[PDB]
Amino acid sequence: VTRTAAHTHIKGLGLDESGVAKRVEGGFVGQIEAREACGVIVDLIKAKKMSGRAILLAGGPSTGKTALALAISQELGPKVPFCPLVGSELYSVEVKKTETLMENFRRAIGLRIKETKEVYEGEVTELTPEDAENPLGGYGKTISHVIVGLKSAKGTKTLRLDPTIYESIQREKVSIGDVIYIEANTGAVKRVGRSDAYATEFDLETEEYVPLPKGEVHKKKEIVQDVTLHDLDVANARPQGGQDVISMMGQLLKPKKTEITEKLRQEVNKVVAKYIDQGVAELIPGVLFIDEVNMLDIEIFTYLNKALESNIAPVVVLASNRGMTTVRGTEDVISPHGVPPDLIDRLLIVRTLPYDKDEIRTIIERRATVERLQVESSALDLLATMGTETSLRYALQLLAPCGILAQTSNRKEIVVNDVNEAKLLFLDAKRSTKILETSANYL
Amino acid sequence: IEIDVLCDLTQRQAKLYQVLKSQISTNYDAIENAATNDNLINAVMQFRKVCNHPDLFERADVDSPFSFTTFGKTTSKFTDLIYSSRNPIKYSLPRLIYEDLILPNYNNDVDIANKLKNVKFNIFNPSTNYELCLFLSKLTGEPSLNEFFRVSTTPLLKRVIERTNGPKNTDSLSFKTITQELLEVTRNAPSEGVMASLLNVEKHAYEREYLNCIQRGYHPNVSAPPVTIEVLGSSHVTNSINNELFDPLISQALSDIPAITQYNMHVKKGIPVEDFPKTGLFPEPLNKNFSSNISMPSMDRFITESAKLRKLDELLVKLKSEGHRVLIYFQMTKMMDLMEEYLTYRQYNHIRLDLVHDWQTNPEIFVFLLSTNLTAADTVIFYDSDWNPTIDSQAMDRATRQVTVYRLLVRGTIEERM
Amino acid sequence: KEETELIEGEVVEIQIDRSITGGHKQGKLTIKTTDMETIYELGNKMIDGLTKEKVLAGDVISIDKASGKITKLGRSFARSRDYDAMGADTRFVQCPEGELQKRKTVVHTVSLHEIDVINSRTQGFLALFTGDTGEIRSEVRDQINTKVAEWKEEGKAEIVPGVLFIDEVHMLDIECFSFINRALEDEFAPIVMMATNRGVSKTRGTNYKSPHGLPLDLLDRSIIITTK
Amino acid sequence: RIKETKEVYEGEVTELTPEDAENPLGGYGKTISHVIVGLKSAKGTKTLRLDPTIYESIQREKVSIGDVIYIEANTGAVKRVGRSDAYATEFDLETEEYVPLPKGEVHKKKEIVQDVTLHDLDVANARPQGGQDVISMMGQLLKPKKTEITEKLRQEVNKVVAKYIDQGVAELIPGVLFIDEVNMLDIEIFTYLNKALESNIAPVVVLASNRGMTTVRGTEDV
């Protein structure tokens, strides 16, 4: 019925009102102190007063770090912008890694604005242009003004237009008998469709037929929009939306990533502060999450050291599964979790712990009940011994071949023999390694 | 006969549900206890409003990008509409830099150095480099020897705008490649020819996958004009900026001329068509849906965005085919004018707001809307169902034949606990 | 799922009105079957597809509204006064009888990547064939994910997952493996089949040796089929 | 190998008369009923009746009396080959291409066999065709940088090519791709050769090398 992939049995941290974690809540089993620390981090993010705060999720593999980050994002809700990332995303061939990191940093800060739009709309009744006295003088255009007559439900207005709006109106290919939508903020014109007052069965362009809009022709309506700071920086760096020829040709060019200067960022921050000061915009700081932080270079860590000192930086969460590991880009710097000691001082490390046999058994229980499968008790004990013997993930992803082998025998129940056939058909890392060592020609 | 109907949450309804869950500090046990007991009432009307219809908590409107503009707005026989969109970011430039670096005067050498580097020392000048011009004319085949000096001294956009397909002489060092030879065959070739069909893969993939009826999925968040530059006390800056932003050649090239205006040029003024400022250079968009960033509220998403409304629309076809008269039971009035809007769109016979007299005498009315004796009523439907028997019992007691009651429920919310 | 209309019949009269330059094009078409005869209105793409593949009076054409495809089936009038400009030998077909306009439901499959390339920029359908789709932004992919799920909720579209096959997977950097380990946990992810003919060899991008040339994080989340 | 039959109408223009209609329509002038064009070639003279729409192509390409033209049959689409040699001494100074009067009859049927490769079809289908957009002519006026051609275009090219072999029109001729001193190839190119040799449309590839027991480039122990 539904589609699942290694997750979506996790609905949150599952804490109490006092911040104490229950044993089984929200699909989580164990990791109580990690969940309590994550709940304190959620409360700190919801406080909306702190900038440049960094935590680190340190532990072994298959201990639930990405699950905890997903729990953070689900606990905060869809209003707070959550920006997941991997450490290999920052190596781009169009721009340097520093600008990619700052792009993600400005992408992790949200904004909510209530915007007033001046809108002319209606059905086009009369479309008559007027000509110029000298069209081949070169300077000035061919026409001078275009008269457009619009009508609505209980209203009819006649507009006199400058040519520049009429170029957009012609570019949307309007006619007499069409319902249009003109906004005055950017001069954009939207063509909705043919009016329903005429015959609708004599066309060949499979167009929609809309009725006349309610209200007057000229309105002012309030629209609540949710944008980030990175959207403002991108829209100002590559200007599209005006009716001048530079923004007209900016859409046709192939888009590319440039290095956004600090002057544009400061001016965008000043305009956003003026928007906030008038009671129009509100600020929603968010979470930036980086998976596999050991893959970052020393230059990216050194730029993170200065980017976390800024006054608009969000809360950044890192994950790593490394012991004493040399940092990439260096030859002798041995550091904990592959993170240099200049970043560790600005970090609050949260430690995840390995699981047990009963925790593995009940985790397999939730993964079986979220995949719409029912297993027996003996097969469940076999899978728990599998998880203790080989891997938790190997026991987790062996459920679907067991279900397929159960379905192909016209049964619903998963038995011990299906798990044994899953042993015989699919291997794990240790058995494949043991095959590789006792092999003739790298079998 | 009493049965209940389960519906599943939509994406939007789940998003406002998650927003309401994360907003009120996750006291979901207290919310369930307050629903089980019946300012937590003001909390739970928001959940009931989200579960009922998403447009009641937040009405759907025109989806458009955010306009990063400071234009001339109205602080409220024709009305003037003039383009006046600017950018909020202002770059301030002093007059001294402009007047002493960009404008020529008596004390600077802008025009002298421009002439010295572009005319006198240009290597395409036929008054000083006639041998190179003759060599390049033998190489390319240009009939004029001033073509290279003209090409090298005008901008690229100006070059591509006014490019003319003039003839070239055959006795030259350059002729046509194989690819262009294949190209010029299929300019106006029809279908079913082998060489035309072998060169028209892209249009075949276009009409094979029905790309002229697909919908747009992405629109940008913020749209902004170019950054305004401000110089105080100079009209030359304003004139140059207005000439650069609104150059008549490029603006006239990207749009078209009206047909009656072209008739006024050609017939009423005797202007030949070769002297027309050439037009139609804007690339045609993929669909008619891809020509704009504004998406209208469609009367199809309103049905699908509410699971109860979609299930009611699915269920109403069977009662229409079987010829019934259905009662809808409500609690609020926002759903009253919402169902008035939906029933006026669907064009169904429904009551305008005596009721008993019109119900008994007129059998043409289909759906009767009521808010908390009808003997001929056959089906009652509880949309926003409530489980207090003192209202439900008088509800089926108020309204001969077999009577079926329908209750629409949403999976995974307060109604499943309810 | 898409809904279209099919129109077939003899052409009685084609009227095409154009500007002096030739940009604005409009006109009317009078098509006719044995029982019915209606007059339609034409657009720019309609006139473009009528001008190419030359249609005269008496020819039988098939019209698909949702695809914009014009196919000429043949000729039936056998016009006597023919100006000898072409060597056309169009087939003699019969008169189509019955309903002029027929409705049918067609099904076509598009890939997700084609939707992102189409919605990426203004002329993305060119870049779908030329391969010039340089580093599509994440906001695009979020909006196509939302709209694809919305199309699933309307009943208009459904997702058919497929198989991604990577032959000689050991010729990959360690950053590719680190990206794969976190890209396999997404909702829109296919089933990935990898093949290796290598033993304990050097992992590319680092200085240790690993089984199958792959790090243990990738081997942790993989079931292994062996061959003999 | 593609074969095609072409029908042509070429020669010197004798007359050019747009014939008017019997009942002209109001609000218009010179309503053409048909176009009469007379041709003149070596040992051949033939007048023709044309579509009224050919007059726009006559006016577009500036065809006058005495010019030699070249009329495709089905598409129309006349074009000016040049000026006849009999008008070479018409003026003192004139920049005009003068060409000989064509031989043979005005009307002929010729079967033309043309040879192209699949890469030409790929690079011709990949680039956008002749239009009026700024992007196409701007890319024509710039440096032609190569691009990574996708497998979808190659798949459709193979599909339409196989469709035109099975009609009996086209014929596929494989050839030889000869790479010598293959010792300089990196191991990634060797793996892509391993992938590409399993294709259906692949030709025969011949390699040459003069090494003995040497390491493969890109590896330090093989």
């Binding site: 007499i176 008998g177 043919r194 007052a197 005429y198 015959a199 609708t200 004599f202 | 047909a259 009656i260 072209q262 008739y263 006024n264 050609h266 017939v267 | 009685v12 009269e13 084609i14 009227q15 095409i16 009105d17 154009r18 500007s19 002096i20 604005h24 409009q26 006109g27 009317k28 209105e41 249609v55 005269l56 009076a57 008496g58 009038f77 016009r79 006064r81 | 209609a21 329509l25 218009y28 002038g29 010179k30 309503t31 053409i32 009923s33 048909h34 579509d51 009224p52 729409t53 007059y55």
Partner: peptide, 28 residues
């Protein structure tokens, strides 16, 4: 009642007519 058709305005524009017996072309 029968809904009226859309108004058709072709002023200052050419015309190509393709009927059964004759084909016309009006030019300005």
């Amino acid at each position: 009642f029968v809904k009226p058709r859309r108004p058709y305005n072709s002023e200052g524009m050419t015309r190509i007519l393709r009927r059964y017996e004759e084909d016309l072309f009006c030019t300005f």
